[PDB]
Ligand binder design. Structure first.
Ligand SMILES: OC[C@H]1O[C@@](CO)(O[C@H]2O[C@H](CO)[C@@H](O)[C@H](O)[C@H]2O)[C@@H](O)[C@@H]1O
Ligand SMILES: OC[C@H]1O[C@@](CO)(O[C@H]2O[C@H](CO)[C@@H](O)[C@H](O)[C@H]2O)[C@@H](O)[C@@H]1O
Ligand SMILES: OC[C@H]1O[C@@](CO)(O[C@H]2O[C@H](CO)[C@@H](O)[C@H](O)[C@H]2O)[C@@H](O)[C@@H]1O
Length: 628
């Protein structure tokens, strides 16, 4: 494989002698040159591990690096300042100062200009991170909520222009808020130019997707493929009008890009540089698990998939150091954590903690949650979890069957219970969720519904508000960057009428994608309403998290409460958090607390608590005790 020095001399060959001389003395080239030397070896290594002796590898690499230079050269000075800032502070993602939020621009604020006007609200809430859902052009009608991309550069006209987006990103930065957007790199819509030209036989786009002449290959692959949306189609393939079959892991209108073609990597890398120069701070790496296929395997989490992601990482270290990756891997816990690494995805969703929060509310038993917090919470240095309560997607019970078996719990039977409970098919359940993708051949099923609908707020369960506070308290204090599903902070319920829209009727996830509720947000400062109670409670926890150093970092140690209903953990050996998942008063004995100071201040309720005697927590009460 070639080296950094050689490649750089060739990149400069596009200039005349006088220009070349000038470029080599510029600060921009100096920085680019240093980063090339430091990070190129990784880029070469990862790419080689995937493409090997592929003839197109070197040519593709030189083209990409040429684009890399032009991209960095054009990169705005403000962004270049951030590049340096994050190079010197890789742990900014681990600061307790960070609190994120996510919303659809259209549902939450109408359009981009409307969103820009909501920025004062985000500052009021205390956000420092904002993820905006798919913003670019997609098919009219059904596009999997924007996840079927028809253009990575043309903004969805209904939202505004690429110009409004630039202003939004600049405004966010002015307010001290990082811009987070999706990098849907595993597939494009079937209306994307690449897909159209590839299917039409354009040699320029040959091998950009996985297309087969018949069911021979598809049938063989399907033997080991997991179905994501079985409601839509079986296996992972869809048939074209001409009879051929195309790999479609998700919806039939979403075609998986073929990364076994180095030109696909180059193409997507170019798109990443485009987003990078808009000022994006974090790219949500959508469906990272599926970017590599291999007959005989599940085609998920394969070695090449990780290598490719690490190659993309190297590209940013070279041409846009400020850009970090947020891994979206909703799979087995042993697989989830493998995507998280300083040289891969610096942060990633923590589906395990999330799913177990809901699990514990249902069972009133923290065994699984405790297990996860004890054995699967801490991460490598310079990386962090993105802890959440809900997202734009359904809830999947992604806990490990192996872990559950250690506790005498049958994973399969347990999920059957959880699914019945959360769709209100279990005596006494307070949840009002909706089924999503019940798979007759596997028994699997997920849950749709807002946090408020799942805790019983729709029917005004008196514990509803407290349940919400409990869930968010854990995501905000366990260690990592907490992500708030905007709307949850005022108790927004389901979009009861989603099933009336023919474009949404077959996707229950829209039940938990309601628009901005004017009535609820208008009540946020009224302590007599559910909206105000939830809002003030979450705002308080956010304020405490950001101002109290005890929450800094992502490391934690669990504390055995000796009460199956109470979760316990310690942050920085100075903050003892307790969470009662029972609707009844629960006690932590004086005996269990012997090692703690006799008195401790509770950051939640603001009172001094005695720890040299039995400590009784009210239903769903949460305590953040400063023990140091
Ligand atoms: O500058 C190094 C050296 O490269 C040569 C080829 O050996 O020319 C290349 O670089 C020039 C300046 O960037 C380009 O104008 C030229 O087209 C390119 O081939 C030498 O001529 C030059 O001394
Ligand atoms: O067949 C799977 C996978 O292999 C690739 C790798 O380039 O194509 C190879 O196999 C094809 C069918 O046998 C050949 O026509 C092709 O020349 C060969 O490189 C991928 O294109 C394909 O997805
Ligand atoms: O149940 C309401 C509504 O949800 C949809 C769309 O997601 O299907 C879900 O519910 C069905 C019945 O429980 C499941 O069989 C299906 O797998 C699940 O996605 C609509 O089809 C249904 O009308």
């Amino acid at each position: 494989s070639p080296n950094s020095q050689y490649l750089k001399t060739r990149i400069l060959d596009i200039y005349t002698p006088e220009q070349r001389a000038g470029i080599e003395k510029s600060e921009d080239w100096r920085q680019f040159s240093r980063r090339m030397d430091t990070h190129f070896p990784k880029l070469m290594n990862e790419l080689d591990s995937v493409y090997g002796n592929n003839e197109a590898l070197l040519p593709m690499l030189e083209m990409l690096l040429a684009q890399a230079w032009q991209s960095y050269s054009q990169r705005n000075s403000s962004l270049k300042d951030i590049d340096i800032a994050r190079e010197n502070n890789p742990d900014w993602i681990l600061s307790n100062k960070q609190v994120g939020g996510v919303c659809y621009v259209d549902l939450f604020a109408g359009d981009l200009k409307g969103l820009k006007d909501k920025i004062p609200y985000f500052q009021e809430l205390g956000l420092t991170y904002l993820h905006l859902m798919p913003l670019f052009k997609c098919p009219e009608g059904k596009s999997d909520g924007g996840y079927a991309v028809s253009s990575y550069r043309d903004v969805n006209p209904a939202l505004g222009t690429i110009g409004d987006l630039r202003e939004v990103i600049a405004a966010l930065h002015e307010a001290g808020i990082s811009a987070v957007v999706d990098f849907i790199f595993n597939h494009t819509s079937n209306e994307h130019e690449w897909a159209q030209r590839c299917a039409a036989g354009d040699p320029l786009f040959d091998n950009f997707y996985y297309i087969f002449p018949d069911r021979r290959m598809p049938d063989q692959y399907d033997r080991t493929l997991r179905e994501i949306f079985p409601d839509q189609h079986p296996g992972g393939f869809s048939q074209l009008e001409d009879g051929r079959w195309v790999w479609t892991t998700f919806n039939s209108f979403q075609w998986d890009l073929n990364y076994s073609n180095p030109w696909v990597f180059r193409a997507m890398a170019g798109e990443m540089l485009f987003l990078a120069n808009l000022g994006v701070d974090i790219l949500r790496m959508d469906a990272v698990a599926f970017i590599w296929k291999q007959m005989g395997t599940s085609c998920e989490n394969l070695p090449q998939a990780h290598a490719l992601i690490r190659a993309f990482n190297a590209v940013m270290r070279i041409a846009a150091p400020a850009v970090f990756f947020k891994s979206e891997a909703i799979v087995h816990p042993d697989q989830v954590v493998q995507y998280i690494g300083q040289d891969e995805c610096q942060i990633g969703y923590n589906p395990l903690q999330m799913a177990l929060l809901w699990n514990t509310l249902a069972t009133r038993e923290v065994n699984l949650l405790h297990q996860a917090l004890t054995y699967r919470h801490n991460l490598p240095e310079h990386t962090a979890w993105v802890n959440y309560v809900r997202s734009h997607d359904d809830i999947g019970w992604t806990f490990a069957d192996e872990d559950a078996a250690y506790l005498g719990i049958s994973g399969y039977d347990h999920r059957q219970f959880l699914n019945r409970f959360f769709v209100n098919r279990f005596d006494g359940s307070f949840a009002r969720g909706v089924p999503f993708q019940y798979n007759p051949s596997t028994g699997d099923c997920r849950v749709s519904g807002t946090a408020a609908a799942l805790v019983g707020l729709a029917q005004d369960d008196p514990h509803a508000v407290d349940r919400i506070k409990l869930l968010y308290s854990i995501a905000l204090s366990t260690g990592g960057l907490p992500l708030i599903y905007l709307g949850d902070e005022v108790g927004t319920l389901n979009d009861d009428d989603w099933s009336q829209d023919s474009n949404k009727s077959d996707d229950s996830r829209w039940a938990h994608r309601p628009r901005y509720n004017e009535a609820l947000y208008a009540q946020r400062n009224d302590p007599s309403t559910a909206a105000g109670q939830i809002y003030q409670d979450l705002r308080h926890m956010i304020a405490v998290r950001q101002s109290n150093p005890r929450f800094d970092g992502g490391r934690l140690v669990t504390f055995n409460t000796n009460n199956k209903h109470i979760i316990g953990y310690i942050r920085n050996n100075a903050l003892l958090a307790f969470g009662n998942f029972s609707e009844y008063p629960q006690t932590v004995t004086a005996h269990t607390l012997q090692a703690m100071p006799f008195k401790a201040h509770d950051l939640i309720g603001g009172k001094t608590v005695s720890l040299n005697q039995d400590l009784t927590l009210q239903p769903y009460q949460v305590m953040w005790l400063e023990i140091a």
